[PDB]
């Protein structure tokens, strides 16, 4: 037999967004691989949040962040008013198949 065993990951805050116009947070799976953070090739769903505000969700922030299961998280300074971002992080879900 073979059954899927799946679990969440921990929190990954690999950058601190920079003040200015081009600044922000760019937490990408390729950057995660380069920095040595373990990146699962296959996944089901991922969760992004603000690291300094661990309660209020993303939509309650109202800031322009794009966060997707294929790429990761991106917040650009120039797209928000004031032209800044918060310090975000994210976590992923890894599932393997274990013999029964």
């Amino acid at each position: 037999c073979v059954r899927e065993v799946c679990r969440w990951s921990s929190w990954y805050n690999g950058h601190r967004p920079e003040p200015g116009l081009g600044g922000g947070d760019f937490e990408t799976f390729e950057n995660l691989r380069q920095r040595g953070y373990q990146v699962c090739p296959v996944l089901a769903d991922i969760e992004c949040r603000a690291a300094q505000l661990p309660d209020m969700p993303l939509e309650e922030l109202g800031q322009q962040v794009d966060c997707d299961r294929m790429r990761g998280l991106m917040c650009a300074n120039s797209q928000q008013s004031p032209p800044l971002c918060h310090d975000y992080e994210l976590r992923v879900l890894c599932c393997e198949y274990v013999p029964c």
């Binding site: 120039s78 928000q80 008013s81």
Partner: protein, 380 residues
């Protein structure tokens, strides 16, 4: 209304509520239909009955990118009773009553706030003006006025007196020259930076942005397109210019593109044409992203069917607004207080605010009651 007589058209006018709008976060179509562009970063008095302080619709336009001409609408702050009340609709959909979060609907002081669909928020007041605010795909505002206020208002949307040459009348008694020069007289805060006139078309920057914006925004003026039905009524040239400018300048090209197409559709439907099925191969990610158990609808022309409403009526459904599109529960279904979409058989009748389950016979005050199909009946 015009009658064919005397060899001519004898035309009388039915009263028409005026309509201001801010679309694309930059373009403004006033009550006199003087379309003009506004690239500003401040809070601007969108409209105000400048005899008194009865109502004051404010709009906060905020710069959204590298370029000074990259703006998004970010809030709509209806001040009221001379600032005693302030209903602030943000861009995420959050509604703040007197700087306090207030979910929707809400009915108090004759003010009614509700969402006809997931794309729009209706702020209906008894003072005369109605606000209809769009959140999806981005933030746009529409304002309706009972024509009684004709030739009385001030602000960005102009004095509503059927004259396009007086729209730039400032508080100093002269007609201003251009858009930005006029707007920089209506800023809310003296510390804001004055808006600047923009000649450089963002369309000239990227050739791929060029071809994308052209190939999509050209769907407006195509005589075989869904939009053709409104061409013989509304000239689509300003809307095509808006679509071009948005998509070329917008970092999220699809968002601003679909905002422009939605704006054209909504304006035409305000004039009384039901443009339908115009999202062929375009803007379909707004079909799919709907909340679960809901679905898209092109003609949403009433309140949202609710179990509470069918049980005990509702103040919400007594407001007439232009038929907007968006995500709603399908016909024959209702959303319970939980918000999930269930048929009438699964949602309960409500007596005195008590959840009285469907198909349940009960006793109350010497009477026998039943809850059939969500409908409450009592006997004896």
């Amino acid at each position: 209304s015009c009658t064919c007589s005397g060899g001519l058209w004898q035309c009388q006018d039915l009263p028409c509520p005026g309509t201001c709008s801010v679309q694309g976060g930059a373009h403004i179509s006033t009550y006199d239909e003087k379309l003009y562009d506004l690239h500003g970063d401040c809070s601007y008095v969108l409209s105000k009955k400048c005899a008194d302080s009865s109502f004051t619709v404010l709009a906060e336009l905020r710069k959204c990118g590298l370029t000074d001409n990259e703006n998004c609408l970010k809030a709509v702050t209806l001040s009221l009773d001379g600032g005693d009340t302030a209903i602030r609709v943000q861009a995420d959909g959050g509604v703040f009553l007197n700087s306090i979060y207030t979910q929707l609907p809400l009915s108090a002081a004759n003010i009614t706030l509700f969402t006809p669909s997931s794309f729009f928020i209706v702020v209906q007041t008894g003072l005369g003006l109605q606000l209809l605010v769009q959140l999806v795909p981005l933030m746009q505002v529409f304002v309706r006025l009972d024509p009684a206020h004709q030739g009385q208002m001030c602000g960005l949307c102009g004095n509503f007196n059927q004259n396009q040459a007086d729209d730039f009348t400032a508080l100093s008694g002269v007609v201003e020259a251009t858009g930005a020069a006029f707007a920089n007289t209506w800023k809310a805060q003296a510390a804001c930076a004055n808006a600047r006139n923009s000649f450089e078309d963002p369309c000239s920057l990227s050739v791929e942005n060029e071809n994308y914006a052209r190939h999509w925004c050209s769907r407006l003026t195509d005589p075989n397109s869904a939009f053709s039905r409104c061409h013989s009524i509304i000239n689509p040239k300003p809307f095509h210019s808006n679509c071009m400018f948005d998509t070329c300048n917008c970092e999220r090209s699809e968002d601003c593109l679909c905002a422009a197409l939605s704006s054209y559709v909504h304006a035409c439907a305000a004039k009384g044409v039901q443009l339908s099925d115009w999202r062929d191969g375009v803007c379909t990610k707004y079909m799919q992203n709907c909340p679960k158990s809901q679905r898209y609808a092109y003609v949403v022309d009433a309140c949202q069917p609710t179990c509470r409403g069918l049980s005990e009526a509702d103040v919400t459904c007594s407001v007439s607004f232009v038929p907007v599109d968006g995500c709603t529960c399908p016909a024959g279904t209702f959303l319970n207080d939980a918000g999930a979409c269930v048929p009438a058989q699964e949602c309960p009748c409500y007596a005195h605010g008590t959840v009285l389950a469907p198909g349940e016979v009960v006793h109350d005050e010497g009477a026998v009651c039943s809850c059939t199909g969500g409908k409450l009946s009592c006997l004896g």
